[PDB]
Amino acid sequence: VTLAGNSSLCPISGWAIYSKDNGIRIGSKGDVFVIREPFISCSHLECRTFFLTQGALLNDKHSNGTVKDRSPYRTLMSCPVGEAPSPYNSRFESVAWSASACHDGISWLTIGISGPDNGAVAVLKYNGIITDTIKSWRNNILRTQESECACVNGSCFTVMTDGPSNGQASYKIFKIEKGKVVKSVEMNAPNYHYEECSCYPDAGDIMCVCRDNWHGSNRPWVSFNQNLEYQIGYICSGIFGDNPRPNDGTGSCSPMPSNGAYGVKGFSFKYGNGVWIGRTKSTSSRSGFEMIWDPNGWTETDSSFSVKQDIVEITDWSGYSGSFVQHPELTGLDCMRPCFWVELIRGRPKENTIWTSGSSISFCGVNSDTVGWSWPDGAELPFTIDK
Amino acid sequence: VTLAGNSSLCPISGWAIYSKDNGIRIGSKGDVFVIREPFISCSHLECRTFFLTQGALLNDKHSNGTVKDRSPYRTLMSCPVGEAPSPYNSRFESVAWSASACHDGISWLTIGISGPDNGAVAVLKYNGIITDTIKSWRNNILRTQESECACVNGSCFTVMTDGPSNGQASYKIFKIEKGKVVKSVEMNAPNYHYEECSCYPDAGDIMCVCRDNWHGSNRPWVSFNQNLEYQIGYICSGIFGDNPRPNDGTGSCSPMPSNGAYGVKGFSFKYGNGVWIGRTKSTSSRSGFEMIWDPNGWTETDSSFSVKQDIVEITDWSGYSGSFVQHPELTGLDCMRPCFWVELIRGRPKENTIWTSGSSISFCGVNSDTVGWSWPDGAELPFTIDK
Amino acid sequence: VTLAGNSSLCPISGWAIYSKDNGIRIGSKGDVFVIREPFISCSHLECRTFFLTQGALLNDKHSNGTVKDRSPYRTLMSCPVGEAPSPYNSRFESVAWSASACHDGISWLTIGISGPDNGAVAVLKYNGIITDTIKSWRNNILRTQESECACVNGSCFTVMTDGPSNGQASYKIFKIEKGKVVKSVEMNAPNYHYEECSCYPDAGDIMCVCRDNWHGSNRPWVSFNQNLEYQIGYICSGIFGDNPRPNDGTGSCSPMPSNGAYGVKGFSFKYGNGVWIGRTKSTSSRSGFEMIWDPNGWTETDSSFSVKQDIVEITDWSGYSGSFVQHPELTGLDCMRPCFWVELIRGRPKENTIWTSGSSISFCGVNSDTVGWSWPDGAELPFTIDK
Amino acid sequence: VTLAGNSSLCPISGWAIYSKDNGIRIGSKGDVFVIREPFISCSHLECRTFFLTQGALLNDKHSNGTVKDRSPYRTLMSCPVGEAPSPYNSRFESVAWSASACHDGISWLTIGISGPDNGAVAVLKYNGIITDTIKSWRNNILRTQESECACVNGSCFTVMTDGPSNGQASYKIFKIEKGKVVKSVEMNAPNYHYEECSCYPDAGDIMCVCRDNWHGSNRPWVSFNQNLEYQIGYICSGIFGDNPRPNDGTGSCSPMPSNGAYGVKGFSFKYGNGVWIGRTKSTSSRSGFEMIWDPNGWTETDSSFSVKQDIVEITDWSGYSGSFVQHPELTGLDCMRPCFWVELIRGRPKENTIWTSGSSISFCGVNSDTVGWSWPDGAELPFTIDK
Ligand SMILES: *[C@@H]1O[C@H](CO)[C@@H](O)[C@H](O)[C@H]1NC(C)=O
Ligand SMILES: *[C@@H]1O[C@H](CO)[C@@H](O)[C@H](O)[C@H]1NC(C)=O
Ligand SMILES: *[C@@H]1O[C@H](CO)[C@@H](O)[C@H](O)[C@H]1NC(C)=O
Ligand SMILES: *[C@@H]1O[C@H](CO)[C@@H](O)[C@H](O)[C@H]1NC(C)=O
Ligand SMILES: *[C@@H]1O[C@H](CO)[C@@H](O)[C@H](O)[C@H]1NC(C)=O
Ligand SMILES: *[C@@H]1O[C@H](CO)[C@@H](O)[C@H](O)[C@H]1NC(C)=O
Ligand SMILES: *[C@@H]1O[C@H](CO)[C@@H](O)[C@H](O)[C@H]1NC(C)=O
Ligand SMILES: *[C@@H]1O[C@H](CO)[C@@H](O)[C@H](O)[C@H]1NC(C)=O
Ligand SMILES: *[C@@H]1O[C@H](CO)[C@@H](O)[C@H](O)[C@H]1NC(C)=O
Ligand SMILES: *[C@@H]1O[C@H](CO)[C@@H](O)[C@H](O)[C@H]1NC(C)=O
Ligand SMILES: *[C@@H]1O[C@H](CO)[C@@H](O)[C@H](O)[C@H]1NC(C)=O
Ligand SMILES: *[C@@H]1O[C@H](CO)[C@@H](O)[C@H](O)[C@H]1NC(C)=O
Ligand SMILES: [Ca+2]
Ligand SMILES: [Ca+2]
Ligand SMILES: [Ca+2]
Ligand SMILES: [Ca+2]
Ligand SMILES: [Ca+2]
Ligand SMILES: [Ca+2]
Ligand SMILES: [Ca+2]
Ligand SMILES: [Ca+2]
Predict the structure, then answer these.
(1) Which of A118, B153, D290, D365 is deepest in the core (most CB within 10 A)?
(2) Within a domain: residue D309?
């Protein structure tokens, strides 16, 4: 049967560690892919990790980074959570350089985008069988979430972008049932920018928090019901969430302009009027990570908070991050559990190698006691191929 | 229960990409077999990839090619679709230097030929148990399809050749039920040549398109029902399909003599009077690939077509190609979906190495939007062992 | 259904060999983790081996041992009994630098401790889902059994320590049902020290034998029922069991002070008034192993035995050891079978390398004929990375 | 349910090839064990390959050959038929330097011998749980079949030897039900020698053909029913079967003395008064292999035969060989199908390396057409470690 998804997030007070795979440390000698943009998604029986490779093994001459990100070699695969991604324990999913995937309670759905920059085509697979395709409508790059899509009562939802990455673009919301596109509307948001949204279900609706890459240092959001009627805005707190960003000060609900261009993919959770914010420690480069709890952050513009918990120290590298949930059909509780993951990037451009890769850690929220520490990557660069 | 196979191919307008394994790029460092003649075949639950190895790993001293193609070391194996063929994730099938395999809805059937050139014997296995054998009837190299066999209502069909490869030969059609040969007739075709046929079922009958290696630059075909009553001919279009071939011009339905003394294994699909033709871009060497749609190509000798879609650019290497289908019991439609695969050869004789190998890509036909691009192999030769 | 565990240990006269994995000999060339503290635990269908890695493969530059034992990289994993632990056949369990795990007849329970030395937090997982946490109550290094926990009628029991490792500490006993902590009491034992206990069920109760690291060369024990009412003492035999230890002489039932101030994790079985003692052959370093049977050892202070059986010679290295049992639901008998395992340490500090690791052997007790021999590790040090 | 085994062998006229794994050719670069004495045994669902390793990978420094054959490192494992034995796809069975195993229709039974030369103890496992042990009764090297044991109606049978290998010894037959020894008698055979027997069931009884290592160049046999009432003799044909052996001449039914004092493990099948003999081509070293059919060979002393089929040429290395069968519950016939396997030894003492290993091929008998060829090993020695 299908995941009902008519429950609310249940209260938490801290986060406990869930997994850590040690990809690069193992990949120094063993056979490990070169990956980027990992993410985690859970069925009603297990949880898996998805990632995007370019066909190259760490510490090999084919890992020379002159291949473009949108190259005809990248693929989407998956391995059980907490394991080093190698060609001997991974499953093939689709051919893509931008992707997402979610499970509706019966079978896996995957979305994968490939093709030239003016004609990219998204291929939708349901249970390993091609079912539908979507073609770019504004002829720039068609890109998608890079994290899990959200399923409620058998239908699964996602958001797509197509247009300039430093100006006004075009935005759409898709509703998918059994691998077939059933309905879609396009957002009417002048002066907003949405990229790489991370969506979660809550009380029968969907909420997504995205990345503003044009003139914003705080984050935008969008929420809609199963009939696609949406609402838009920005997070009104004074604890800015993007990267780069100014210092903490007086926030605002319309785009914040200071240090706005560029960003990193991120997330947040809504609890009434409060908000849990996850952001990097450094205001100019991708270093560190922490979790903040501002009890009036969704609607008030002050810069005062209540609880902070450390995840990675400010001297170590981090990257993308996103959210995922565990349904009651899996965990046996009567509430939706929230979790999240982080990606730790090593290599170019901040270090002197020829490659670039990432590993992951992930946490899940609880109500009992917790502690704050630092769980960095720990690889010792440069490798043999670099010398 | 068994696959009924009493339905027709359903309409398509383009092809979408399905898989890509990146064999050689990974095999530069990891442990990957040296393979040739890959092909794909699907059961009622999954799809697998079959291939022929010589017992050697890539980038090793045993990969030197002083070994004949018909050697006592080659074997047939299989791995899940879209994965690099390695000894740690492959299944053993049979000992052979020429093979084919299909699934009837209950268990796998495999055919494998081994032995000397004047006494080769084909061993038939059903569910991993030897059941029957066929011995050469003209004491010359015995050979078979090199792609999937076609099953309708439980019975499975295949075509075999035995005789000279530059003159008149002897041809047979076999009907197999549960690994036992039930009926066989030999074709009466003077001035025809059939090798490496690729067969698919359509509306309760079988249609095969083969390779003419004696004096033909276009392709022959044969169709028969479940009682083995056949019909023969050539494709009457003016868009020649073999390789090497002359320039496009006025075609014919009897062997085209110009440039017709060698070839490459290929395929085609029939839609009423039209035809989908898949052929290499270069007229003299194995470079490129494309798909053509000639609405009157099965019976008219005119060189005008309607739609072309690119698969690999003319500057990159390609090779064999064939067809396979996905039954309604697997995909849930009311069709018989068509698909195809391509092999990309790297190494001797066109390059300066000591080995030769191939990887694969595959596509499946749809009715929504698609795009044309190039998905080449991408390995950087020569390897370490060559230096 | 759940393991009843209301039966007694059945009589034995000797031990037969059960498994041997050859970790280091294989790891000289292949890809094998660097592990320590292995242990074995059995469900109602199979038996598995758990271990703690630091994220590094054997014979690699990341195996350089300047990483602390309590580091943010260690993880808990498991592989089938008798196999070399490699990243291609292991399952991820939890992130920890101190752990234990047992199976209640329905699903696996794992406990893992991570965090700083003054705030360590234990995360309890039941069937792969986080359920509860325990935080340190005296702000010193928190630590647990390092071997299997004991389950009787669905409930599972374990013992934890928190405080100085050369003085008085604080001790607790926990009762867990379906991953939730239900009851706990703290031991009142002045002048006792308990670390790394190895517990087994017997006739509906629990008995644990632990390691005294403050002033003891013989071992302490504790026994309790399902309502947590405990009894404490020391093993009253004159065959001392710890390491380092004095020569055999007149034993005591309260701490023996001579050569007491250190130890190694060990075990013992109780049979009425007798006892089976497993200890190293050398009295000052970890070399050798043997099994002793003293028919009045649990309550009498003489030093006279009846049977000795050799496991490893005195010239070879050994280490930790512990106990586990096989329930009637698994083995089909009418009695609880006892078994044990041993760890063989190679590398620093007794040898000139840069790493340290261990492999394992294990035995199970029978009633028929047996033999004594030596089954050492057998690796030839130093490795290539050391040169 | 259990294998009934009340059927007779069904008629055959030739042998068809079944599997070939290519162990050494792959092991030149990949990770492959160093094995000896492989054998094949089939359940009611599949067939597996068992072998004895010493803990070392091919092409590694631990593969030196100063370790004795009876060493504390050897183990018994198994992998699916037709695959290269590697630590990433093998199952652990038992710790032994002499072994056998058979399947009764419900679970696997394995026998493994380990220990010193005057106290070796055999450990019997049924479904992975230790059940019984047998200890040496004459304090000399205890040894067993090295191939599959034979099961009829829920009981499984085997033969064991203990005593000198160049003189009179002591012989026993064991009957095992569910891993427990139920009955045993010792053979009364003056002037006979039995080692490494290969047994198969036929019409409700058991027949074994063994190796005479004291003064025999032809082979002995023994047959018994389910109550252990035996009959003894020698094969009365003039086509000698051992190795070394004299030239073909007039045979005898009592020990043949010429060139008798050594041998190699072998097999034979009985058909009324005929016999199928499998022997090496060279009369002094282990080179080649062939199958002979002497229609009166079981009772007559002439040297004339009818059919010969080649398996390996006389210029290539071979070794041990044995027999196994496929029950009607597996194959679906009304027979008991016969098959066999061969081992191909490479390395010391006939070649200049530091190691020794073997790969395998296997054949199964049919009634249709067949061919004779040569399927040798094909590795190119010496390896890198030898240089
Ligand atoms: C939600 O739906 C489920 C199944 O339909 C039902 O059991 C549950 O009580 C509903 N109520 C909530 C939690 O909103
Ligand atoms: C990476 O590629 C550049 C050329 O594009 C080349 O000069 C450089 O040597 C390469 N590095 C390696 C290790 O191949
Ligand atoms: C949920 O799905 C069921 C079955 O399609 C449908 O009847 C129902 O209207 C849907 N809505 C909810 C949330 O009940
Ligand atoms: C094939 O036969 C089956 C069985 O009657 C039928 O259900 C199916 O519709 C037929 N398909 C076609 C399209 O003829
Ligand atoms: C390949 O084989 C040829 C012919 O035997 C030999 O001369 C050459 O050295 C071989 N190359 C390698 C790398 O072994
Ligand atoms: C399919 O085969 C079965 C078995 O021979 C037969 O009974 C059935 O009639 C066949 N169906 C058709 C339409 O031929
Ligand atoms: C253990 O308890 C079960 C019932 O749970 C009972 O049937 C069994 O006989 C008891 N065994 C012993 C040895 O007490
Ligand atoms: C091991 O670590 C020490 C301390 O940093 C370092 O000096 C030494 O060079 C390292 N050895 C190796 C093999 O890396
Ligand atoms: C075992 O536990 C169950 C509760 O799950 C209880 O009902 C039963 O009485 C217990 N058995 C004994 C003998 O304590
Ligand atoms: C073997 O025994 C079974 C009953 O166990 C019987 O049905 C079968 O016919 C017998 N077969 C032969 C060949 O004796
Ligand atoms: C093999 O063993 C011998 C005897 O110890 C030794 O002298 C020789 O060096 C070894 N060879 C290798 C490659 O280790
Ligand atoms: C096979 O064994 C079963 C169990 O002993 C027995 O009942 C049956 O009679 C045996 N069959 C024959 C034919 O011996
Ligand atoms: Ca921004
Ligand atoms: Ca606030
Ligand atoms: Ca041609
Ligand atoms: Ca035309
Ligand atoms: Ca002590
Ligand atoms: Ca005593
Ligand atoms: Ca002899
Ligand atoms: Ca004769």
Answers:
(1) D365
(2) yes
